Amino acid sequence: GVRTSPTGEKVTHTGQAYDDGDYRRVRFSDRQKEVNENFAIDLIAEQPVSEVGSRVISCDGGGGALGHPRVYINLDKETKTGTCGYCGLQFRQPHH
Amino acid sequence: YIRPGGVHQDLPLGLLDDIYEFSKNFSFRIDELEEMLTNNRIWRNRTVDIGVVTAEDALNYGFSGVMLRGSGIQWDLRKTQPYDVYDQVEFDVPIGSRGDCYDRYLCRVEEMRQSLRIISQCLNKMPPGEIKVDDAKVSPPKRAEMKTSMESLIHHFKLYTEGYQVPPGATYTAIEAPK
Amino acid sequence: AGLLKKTTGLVGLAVCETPHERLKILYTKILDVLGQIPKNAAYRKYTEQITNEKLGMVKAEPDVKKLEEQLQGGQIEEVILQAENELSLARKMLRWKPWEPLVEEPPANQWKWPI
Amino acid sequence: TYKFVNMREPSMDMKSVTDRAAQTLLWTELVRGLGMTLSYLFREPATINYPFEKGPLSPRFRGEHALRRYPSGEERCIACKLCEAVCPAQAITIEAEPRADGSRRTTRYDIDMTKCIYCGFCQEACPVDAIVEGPNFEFSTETHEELLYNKEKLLNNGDKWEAEIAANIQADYLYR
Amino acid sequence: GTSVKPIFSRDMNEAKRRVRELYRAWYREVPNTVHLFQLDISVKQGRDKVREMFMKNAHVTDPRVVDLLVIKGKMELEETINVWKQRTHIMRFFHETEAPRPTDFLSKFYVGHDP
Amino acid sequence: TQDTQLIAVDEKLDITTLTGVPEEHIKTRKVRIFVPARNNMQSGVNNTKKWKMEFDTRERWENPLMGWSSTADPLSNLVLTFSTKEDAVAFAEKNGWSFDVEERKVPKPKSKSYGANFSWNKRTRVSTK
Amino acid sequence: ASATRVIQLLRNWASGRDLQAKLQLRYQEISKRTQPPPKLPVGPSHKLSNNYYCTRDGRREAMPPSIVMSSQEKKAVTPAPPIKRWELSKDQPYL
Amino acid sequence: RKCDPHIGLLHRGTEKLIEYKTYLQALPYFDRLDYVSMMCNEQAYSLAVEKLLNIQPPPR
Amino acid sequence: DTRPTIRPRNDVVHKQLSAFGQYVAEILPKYVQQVQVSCFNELEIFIHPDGVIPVLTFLRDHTNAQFKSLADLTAVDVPTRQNRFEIVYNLLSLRFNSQIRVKTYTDELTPIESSVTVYKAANWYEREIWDMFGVFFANHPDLRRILTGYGFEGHPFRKDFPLSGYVELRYDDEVKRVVAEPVELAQEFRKFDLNSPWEAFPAYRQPPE
Amino acid sequence: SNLIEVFVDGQSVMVEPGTTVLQACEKVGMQIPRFCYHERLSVAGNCRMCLVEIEKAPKVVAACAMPVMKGWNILTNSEKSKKAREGVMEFLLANHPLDCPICDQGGECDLQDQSMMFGSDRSRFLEGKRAVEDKNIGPLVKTIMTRCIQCTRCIRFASEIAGVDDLGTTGRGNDMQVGTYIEKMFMSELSGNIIDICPVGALTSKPYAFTARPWETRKTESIDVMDAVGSNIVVSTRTGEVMRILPRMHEDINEEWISDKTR
Numbered sequence A: 001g002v003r004t005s006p007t008g009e010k011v012t013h014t015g016q017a018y019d020d021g022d023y024r025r026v027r028f029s030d031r032q033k034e035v036n037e038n039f040a041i042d043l044i045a046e047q048p049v050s051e052v053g054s055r056v057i058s059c060d061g062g063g064g065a066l067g068h069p070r071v072y073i074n075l076d077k078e079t080k081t082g083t084c085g086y087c088g089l090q091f092r093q094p095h096h
Numbered sequence B: 001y002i003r004p005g006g007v008h009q010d011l012p013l014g015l016l017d018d019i020y021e022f023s024k025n026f027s028f029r030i031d032e033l034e035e036m037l038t039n040n041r042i043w044r045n046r047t048v049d050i051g052v053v054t055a056e057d058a059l060n061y062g063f064s065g066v067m068l069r070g071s072g073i074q075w076d077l078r079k080t081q082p083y084d085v086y087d088q089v090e091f092d093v094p095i096g097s098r099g100d101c102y103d104r105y106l107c108r109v110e111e112m113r114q115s116l117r118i119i120s121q122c123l124n125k126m127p128p129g130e131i132k133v134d135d136a137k138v139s140p141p142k143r144a145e146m147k148t149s150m151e152s153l154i155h156h157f158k159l160y161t162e163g164y165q166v167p168p169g170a171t172y173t174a175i176e177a178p179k
Numbered sequence C: 001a002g003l004l005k006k007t008t009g010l011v012g013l014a015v016c017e018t019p020h021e022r023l024k025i026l027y028t029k030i031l032d033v034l035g036q037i038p039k040n041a042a043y044r045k046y047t048e049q050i051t052n053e054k055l056g057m058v059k060a061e062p063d064v065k066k067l068e069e070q071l072q073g074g075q076i077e078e079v080i081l082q083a084e085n086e087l088s089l090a091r092k093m094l095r096w097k098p099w100e101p102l103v104e105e106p107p108a109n110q111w112k113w114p115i
Numbered sequence D: 001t002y003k004f005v006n007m008r009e010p011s012m013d014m015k016s017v018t019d020r021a022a023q024t025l026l027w028t029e030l031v032r033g034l035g036m037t038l039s040y041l042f043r044e045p046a047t048i049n050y051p052f053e054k055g056p057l058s059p060r061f062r063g064e065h066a067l068r069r070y071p072s073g074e075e076r077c078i079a080c081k082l083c084e085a086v087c088p089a090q091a092i093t094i095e096a097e098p099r100a101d102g103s104r105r106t107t108r109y110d111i112d113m114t115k116c117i118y119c120g121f122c123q124e125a126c127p128v129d130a131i132v133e134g135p136n137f138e139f140s141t142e143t144h145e146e147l148l149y150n151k152e153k154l155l156n157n158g159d160k161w162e163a164e165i166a167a168n169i170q171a172d173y174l175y176r
Numbered sequence E: 001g002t003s004v005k006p007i008f009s010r011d012m013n014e015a016k017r018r019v020r021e022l023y024r025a026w027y028r029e030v031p032n033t034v035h036l037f038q039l040d041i042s043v044k045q046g047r048d049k050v051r052e053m054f055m056k057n058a059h060v061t062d063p064r065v066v067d068l069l070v071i072k073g074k075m076e077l078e079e080t081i082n083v084w085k086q087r088t089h090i091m092r093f094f095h096e097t098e099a100p101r102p103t104d105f106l107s108k109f110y111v112g113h114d115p
Numbered sequence F: 001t002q003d004t005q006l007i008a009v010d011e012k013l014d015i016t017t018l019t020g021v022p023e024e025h026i027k028t029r030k031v032r033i034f035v036p037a038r039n040n041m042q043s044g045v046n047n048t049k050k051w052k053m054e055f056d057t058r059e060r061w062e063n064p065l066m067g068w069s070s071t072a073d074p075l076s077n078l079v080l081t082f083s084t085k086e087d088a089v090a091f092a093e094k095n096g097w098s099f100d101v102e103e104r105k106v107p108k109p110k111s112k113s114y115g116a117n118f119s120w121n122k123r124t125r126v127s128t129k
Numbered sequence G: 001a002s003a004t005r006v007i008q009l010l011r012n013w014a015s016g017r018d019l020q021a022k023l024q025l026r027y028q029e030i031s032k033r034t035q036p037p038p039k040l041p042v043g044p045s046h047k048l049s050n051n052y053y054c055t056r057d058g059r060r061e062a063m064p065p066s067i068v069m070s071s072q073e074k075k076a077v078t079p080a081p082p083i084k085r086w087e088l089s090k091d092q093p094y095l
Numbered sequence H: 001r002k003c004d005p006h007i008g009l010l011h012r013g014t015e016k017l018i019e020y021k022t023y024l025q026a027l028p029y030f031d032r033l034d035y036v037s038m039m040c041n042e043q044a045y046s047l048a049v050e051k052l053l054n055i056q057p058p059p060r
Numbered sequence I: 001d002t003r004p005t006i007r008p009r010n011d012v013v014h015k016q017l018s019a020f021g022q023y024v025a026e027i028l029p030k031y032v033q034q035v036q037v038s039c040f041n042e043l044e045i046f047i048h049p050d051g052v053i054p055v056l057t058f059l060r061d062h063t064n065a066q067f068k069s070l071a072d073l074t075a076v077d078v079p080t081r082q083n084r085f086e087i088v089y090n091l092l093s094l095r096f097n098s099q100i101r102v103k104t105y106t107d108e109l110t111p112i113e114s115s116v117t118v119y120k121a122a123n124w125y126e127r128e129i130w131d132m133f134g135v136f137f138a139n140h141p142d143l144r145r146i147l148t149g150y151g152f153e154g155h156p157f158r159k160d161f162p163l164s165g166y167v168e169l170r171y172d173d174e175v176k177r178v179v180a181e182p183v184e185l186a187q188e189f190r191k192f193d194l195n196s197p198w199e200a201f202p203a204y205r206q207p208p209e
Numbered sequence J: 001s002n003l004i005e006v007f008v009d010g011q012s013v014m015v016e017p018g019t020t021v022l023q024a025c026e027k028v029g030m031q032i033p034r035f036c037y038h039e040r041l042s043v044a045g046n047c048r049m050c051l052v053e054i055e056k057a058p059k060v061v062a063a064c065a066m067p068v069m070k071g072w073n074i075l076t077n078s079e080k081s082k083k084a085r086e087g088v089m090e091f092l093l094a095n096h097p098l099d100c101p102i103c104d105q106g107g108e109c110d111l112q113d114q115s116m117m118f119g120s121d122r123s124r125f126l127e128g129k130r131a132v133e134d135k136n137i138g139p140l141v142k143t144i145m146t147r148c149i150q151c152t153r154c155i156r157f158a159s160e161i162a163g164v165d166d167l168g169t170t171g172r173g174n175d176m177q178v179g180t181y182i183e184k185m186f187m188s189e190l191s192g193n194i195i196d197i198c199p200v201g202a203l204t205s206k207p208y209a210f211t212a213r214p215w216e217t218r219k220t221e222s223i224d225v226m227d228a229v230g231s232n233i234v235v236s237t238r239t240g241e242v243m244r245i246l247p248r249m250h251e252d253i254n255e256e257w258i259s260d261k262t263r
């Protein structure tokens, strides 16, 4: 979800938004900023949480060799769905 | 492509056949070159007997390759100092008699034919083997092993941060360039 | 001997019409120029051994063909050049005086590899 | 083994001198040169009709960096910065920061197109195949600035191509 | 270890000697280099440019280095005489484009953190 | 031992004029040495064995564009190497440069006794290994 | 390929060669651009046993340059045996 | 009579940057050394480095 | 050498260079400081500065050495060592297919009489050394700045010379000519501290000096 | 005197009695690989990485805790010592999670650099791994306990140096975990010091986390000002701003430890 600034300046996922007083905004008129509308924060948020009944789940991320190293995910935290640092896919432990 | 410790990537499937397709016809185009240039009197009278250089003067000037072989000097790096597998392959060294621009020109085009010979032998001598040394401290581990094993992860990580630790010393490893 | 060759295989260097006796007389030159060198000097004991030997096989068979493979010096015409080069040295160190000991040891760790 | 080149000897007999004298007076090797070019005139050309015809390439082509994304949607680059360390021209400029979710994500990923060399080292660096060189070469520009790429352009390039480069690494990761 | 090999200047006078004709040639050099190279610089400020270059480094006392700038200055002159150097190279000594660096501590302070 | 018209040079060598560094960069540049302290997170020691020539850091203004750290300090990126401080100062004085010294960080004697970690009337007993 | 017959004999005559036997443009001999999955081999030392790095550690095997003479009967010797004269190529002895 | 082939017009301090980079990043310099026979330069660099490393390349 | 990772050693010629090294050492012990060979069958005999003439004149003319192919005239700065500049020769023997290499030590000022006589190939190399490292050589026919820019300042491969340099260039309209301003980089060279603090090779380790 | 001469790998050097093998090795300059041993901290002898073979012995001696005897040849480069080094090194590395690009210790990891020099060039592990629940303590130090090699340096630098009971080694065998069992928040004034003692990224600095990496930083040394001690510190400017503070070793003022308020 891209957000706009008061001067109509759409913000990027990093949060950069040049204010009106910034002289560095003059390259922006007559032209445009390229904004990755697919904000990386919310195309992972809508992804569901898979249910695997094990204490440690591999996280290859699909594609076999095409993915991220198979860092093993610890699954015993009931209050925290264990997510992978590489791909961010949240993994869960069946509700006992 | 050629990196310390082997070669980076492997030959794509079918490319060796394409090399044979090109090699089988490249001999024709050099017959076209020699016919166009070598025989024509304009090419000779403009380029032969021009820029001669004596053998002792040539070598003592630090010259090499086509400078020496064209000007009578009998020396080639592959034949004398055999580096890599160049000893196994067979070829001829087209040295010249006088050593002018024309003689050097003919020396180049005869090495071209000799290059085709070396291509023929090595292409038919392709072995079953890996493309890079089996030493992860100098060669990057396979991408399948990259994301599978911890040693491979570290070894590629460190090789791609600082590289590899080369033992001290110095050398003058020299091979003949096509120049 | 045989038929005198037309090309030596190297431009500039020509076939000598007087192969062996020319090489012999310049070889006697490199015996005598070596004379004014003291015997304890190493270059003498190397040279007169290498001198007095190849003065032998040249007079061992006056023919050009066999003598190419007596010395492994290639064609005789370049042996004239190289023996002349050896003559040049004997004149060179007649003034170099390279036999008293090493001039001075190198400044501290002047090689020291690695640092 | 060796071989001379210019060691042909001219024959002095009546026949041989006649051909050489005929060659000098009646230019024949010159006509031989003429015949070579004329035979090539009737030879079909090999001129690729750009832009409608385009030269061949290989699935390994390197150019036009573009960050990719996982099938879920999140971008691949975890800011492991091996590409930065490897980059032999130091064209890459990456600054990391802990994202609000918790996993890393580069807040600054500029690769200067006119410092880069397209050596293909960067794809071999990141183990998550985050940055790759796409098949594009059709990004010539008229101002020096637009060559200076950033994270936003890199992602936009990735989303633009993705599908083409998706099959490229699928047919090449076996070799790698 | 104070005793070391000299290049050309066995003493100070020979170092003073070589500086002399170096300026003799260079003083005779300024009017024409402007003339051929079409430099918009009068002869006068060309001449004393060589002057303050000459004592911009005329403070060192080691005889081994002073003649090294002599040959360095010697050959900077040779490169100029034969139109090898171009307009940018001759002008390059005549610094134009940069503003004078600060003189008082007030000016050092006002520009930035630089000293 | 090298007798060829040698000149008895009694003055310290000053090669500063040959190297032709800018005058503002030979006086207004404090040049310092020390042997690097080991990176505390890394127990390895094979880096605190050499002296280095490093300089003072000038200003680093952010670029008006994307934001590279534009610098105008050519001498900043000049980390040299030195086997001993005596050779380090020798380079410093040979091209006379405003310099300061620093002493080699030398380890102290760690009196280690694994038998001490367990005791009867001594308090160095460790509760958990 | 392409061309017609009477053109071929025209360029065949003018060049004195049969160009139709082999040309300089690829038509159908080119290998198919898409290829099967290239199952690559493994390393020569790829084994779960007796492959410790104690054996193959070439970087470690290197020894500092072996010193023989330092500042701090006999016979003459050569740096290498004198080279031997190559013979004419029996394939093409004279161009 | 006398010829002076002045050079430098393309000069790049190739080995000056080679010192600051490591061996792998140094490899593209060699490919750009001779812009005619590029991989032959790669051959020389790879042979030199693996000569110091006391490691020989695989026969393939 | 059943293992294919390490390169095989070659002992027959390895002993041959050492024998030849002693052979050269005994002849001219006035100038050879020390001689040694490495693992990769590369022998190096070390000479004194004023020895550029006869040692090469030896290798160029000896009937049993005859090293005439001048390979390269390199220099290696070592700031630690007093004679930081280390001029390195390299010769190749045509008949005996070997590579000799002689190197000396030299200060910034101390000269070397030009070895263009033994090898005129050194002449063109000799220009580069004074351009590239800055070491002046005595009695040189024409020792010129040939590879660096016209009117350059200093010697770039002295390890005290910045990689970026000292002067940058641009075309200036108000003078209609290229003006050499001091460098002002758009981006600073991000130096990388690439030195593992653990022992790399116990073999070549320097003992406590 | 009572000094004892020991012919370490040949070269013979005297040393005070009771001195362990490592001090003899580093006396020559032999940096013997170690993980669970830090100079000013109690001895564990746990990692078994400093196993070096002593001459005239049928067993490899644990050089960490073992004192030196009257005359001994430390086989530093022997095959047996390197075999012992290789066996335990891949042993620690076996259960190590594959997060070098993710873990902040990348480029300043002992487990990384040691494997470059004293390590294999491939793997022989085919089974799965073990993942540990990340103990959450402090908004100032981050714990990734799957990366822990259980060198117990944290627990000793805690109980001896900090003099506070904070961490434990709860569990048994492969399942023994370094932590607090019951949840807490370790809060010492010098709490920001275990980050550096940790040979791996099991404990890292939260604010500096995911911000900069070794080769970018150009370390500059200075002293602390937050306290009257004036602790020697190392600044970590990367591109014109300060990332992290390292406790420069000087012994008298601060050794190589600095309190949180300074780092």
Ligand code: SF4
Residues within 6 Å of the ligand: D083, D086, D087, D088, D089, D090, D091, D092, D111, D115, D116, D117, D118, D119, D120, D121, D122, D123
């Ligand atoms: S292709 Fe090479 S130069 Fe370009 S960004 Fe990648 S690593 Fe850097």
Ligand code: SF4
Residues within 6 Å of the ligand: D076, D077, D078, D079, D080, D081, D082, D083, D084, D094, D122, D125, D126, D127, D128, D129, D130, D131
């Ligand atoms: S190497 Fe790949 S994963 Fe690492 S920072 Fe660069 S793009 Fe991201």
Ligand code: SF4
Residues within 6 Å of the ligand: B154, J096, J097, J098, J099, J100, J101, J103, J104, J105, J106, J107, J109, J110, J111, J112, J147, J199, J200, J201, J202
């Ligand atoms: S601590 Fe573990 S994950 Fe982190 S860099 Fe070291 S080996 Fe890699």
Ligand code: SF4
Residues within 6 Å of the ligand: J147, J148, J149, J150, J151, J152, J153, J154, J155, J178, J197, J198, J199, J200, J202, J203
């Ligand atoms: S958390 Fe770190 S210091 Fe503590 S035992 Fe584990 S690896 Fe050692």
Ligand code: FES
Residues within 6 Å of the ligand: J033, J034, J035, J036, J037, J044, J045, J046, J047, J048, J049, J050, J063, J064, J065
């Ligand atoms: S370091 Fe000695 S056993 Fe862990």
Ligand SMILES: [K+]
Residues within 6 Å of the ligand: F041, J105, J194, J195, J196, J197, J198, J199, J200, J201, J202, J203, J204
């Ligand atoms: K740590």
Ligand SMILES: [Zn+2]
Residues within 6 Å of the ligand: A059, A060, A061, A068, A084, A085, A086, A087, A088, A089
């Ligand atoms: Zn994952």
